[PDB]
Structure 1
Amino acid sequence: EVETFAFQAEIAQLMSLIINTFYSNKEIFLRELISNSSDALDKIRYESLTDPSKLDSGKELHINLIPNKQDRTLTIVDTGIGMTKADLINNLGTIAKSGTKAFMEALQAGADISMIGQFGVGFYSAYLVAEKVTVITKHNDDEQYAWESSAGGSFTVRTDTGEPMGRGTKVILHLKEDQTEYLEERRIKEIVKKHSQFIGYPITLFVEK
């Protein structure tokens, strides 16, 4: 049972700009997603300071990067607070309408796409490198859900019957054919070292057979 939703017009416009603007510095997508994971981990850590049972769904707070060259996917897994179904539908827990407004004014005034995270809509930089993004998420207060979009104005949400997660979010980037450098170990290592050196959670880059 799959529900299909239209993006708000402003978010569709943000996505189209990310997909269609010529902009070579695409590697910042990974910095933005790791930053989102770190923010999510901070939230469950803060809740656990007064309620340790918030971590009954998993005590480890970490970020895993999982490339898969056979599936042509890069997956960013974190064990942060996760998202409810309502959060997924409401632009993955962002204030993306007002963030898009500010971002596009900043671009017109001289900013570049790499500054997207300053406007709270860094998730959508995934579409720099991905033709399709799948987000699997589990929040303590809701069931496990899968969000998916290939842009084009719509996204789907469904209950996820697959691999249970415990708690957190998994962002699965189905990479564009010409963006497979981001499955290479040395390239991912370089980006993490350049842009994510002060992320306060272990980031484990998985290797492939």
Structure 2
Amino acid sequence: EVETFAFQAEIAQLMSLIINTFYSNKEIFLRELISNSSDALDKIRYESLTDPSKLDSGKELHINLIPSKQDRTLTIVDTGIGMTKADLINNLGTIAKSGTKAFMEALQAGADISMIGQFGVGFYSAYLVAEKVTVITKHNDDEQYAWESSAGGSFTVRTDTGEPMGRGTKVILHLKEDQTEYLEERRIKEIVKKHSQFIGYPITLFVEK
């Protein structure tokens, strides 16, 4: 049961800009995804202060970075709050619309693509390095879903039947052929140290077998 949805025009336009503009500082994508994971961990942590049963789906709050040369993927996993089906279909796009317009309005005013996270739409920087992004997510009181898009103006949502996650989000970046440097341990360590050194949750960089 795979449902296909159209992005709103403004988000499709942003995704095309990210894919089409010449911009060499592509490494910013990782800081943006780690920042989103940190925000999601903050949210479940806060909610658990008034309802401790929200951690029944997992007490550990952490971020894992997992490279796979065999699959040509870099995966960012967190045990944060996760996303509901309504988030995937509607709420993400609703929240992003204003920031996308504002980001587009900073760019021609002279701003740089690296400021994308200040407009709340840093996730889409994943398309600087990925030809396709698959997102597996599980929110308390909702099912585990898989969202996917190769930026054709459309994305898909389906119920996920893979390894149950407990709670959180996995962003799976299917890297472009010429962006495999982001599978290298030395490269990922360099990027995390430079842009993500003061995140308040443990970040584990897995090593490839």
Pairwise same-fold verdict (TM > 0.5): yes
For 1:156, what is the secondary structure of its paired residue?
strand
1:68 and 2:47 are equivalent in the alignment:
no
Deviation at 1:95, TM superposition (A): 1.1
1:154-181 alpha-carbon deviations (Å, 9 max, x no partner): 0000000111000000000000000000
Aligned to 2:188: 188
1:133-160 alpha-carbon deviations (Å, 9 max, x no partner): 0000000021000000000100000000
Instruction: Please show how residues 101-120 of structure 1 align to structure 2 within 5 Å.
Output: 101-120=101-120
Instruction: Please show how residues 14-33 of structure 1 align to structure 2 within 5 Å.
Output: 14-33=14-33
For 1:95, what is the secondary structure of its paired residue?
helix
**2:11–2:93 contact (8 Å) kept in structure 1:** no
> Which structure 2 residue ranges, 5 or more long, are not aligned?
none
> Which structure 1 residue ranges, 5 or more long, are not aligned?
none
**1:136–1:170 contact (8 Å) kept in structure 2:** yes
Deviation at 1:92, TM superposition (A): 3.7
**1:94–1:121 contact (8 Å) kept in structure 2:** no
**2:65–2:75 contact (8 Å) kept in structure 1:** yes
**2:72–2:175 contact (8 Å) kept in structure 1:** yes
CA spacing shift, 1:114–1:91, aligned 2, 3 Å: farther
- Rounded to whole Å, the distance in 2 between the matches of 1:38 and 1:114 is 18
- Rounded to whole Å, the distance in 1 between the matches of 2:30 and 2:187 is 11
CA spacing shift, 1:72–1:38, aligned 2, 3 Å: same
1:177 and 2:140 are equivalent in the alignment:
no
TM-score by length of 2: 0.98
For 1:65, what is the secondary structure of its paired residue?
strand
For 1:94, what is the secondary structure of its paired residue?
helix
Deviation at 1:94, TM superposition (A): 6.4
CA spacing shift, 1:196–1:60, aligned 2, 3 Å: same
Deviation at 1:190, TM superposition (A): 0.3
**2:139–2:168 contact (8 Å) kept in structure 1:** yes
**How many pairs were matched up?**
209
Aligned to 2:153: 153
What's the Cα RMSD here?
A: 0.9
Instruction: Please show how residues 120-159 of structure 1 align to structure 2 within 5 Å.
Output: 120-159=120-159
CA spacing shift, 1:101–1:93, aligned 2, 3 Å: closer
**2:8–2:93 contact (8 Å) kept in structure 1:** no
For 2:83, what is the secondary structure of its paired residue?
coil
**1:94–1:120 contact (8 Å) kept in structure 2:** no
- Rounded to whole Å, the distance in 2 between the matches of 1:132 and 1:208 is 21
**1:136–1:144 contact (8 Å) kept in structure 2:** yes
**1:83–1:92 contact (8 Å) kept in structure 2:** no
**2:44–2:54 contact (8 Å) kept in structure 1:** yes
TM-score by length of 1: 0.98
- Rounded to whole Å, the distance in 1 between the matches of 2:117 and 2:26 is 13
Deviation at 1:93, TM superposition (A): 7.0
CA spacing shift, 1:101–1:90, aligned 2, 3 Å: same
Instruction: Please show how residues 1-20 of structure 1 align to structure 2 within 5 Å.
Output: 1-20=1-20
**1:83–1:93 contact (8 Å) kept in structure 2:** no
1:9-46 alpha-carbon deviations (Å, 9 max, x no partner): 00000000000000000000000000000000000000
1:36-79 alpha-carbon deviations (Å, 9 max, x no partner): 00000000000011111110000000000000001000000000
CA spacing shift, 1:36–1:94, aligned 2, 3 Å: farther
For 2:97, what is the secondary structure of its paired residue?
helix
Moved over 6 A (4+): none
Deviation at 1:90, TM superposition (A): 2.3
- Percentage of identical aligned residues: 100
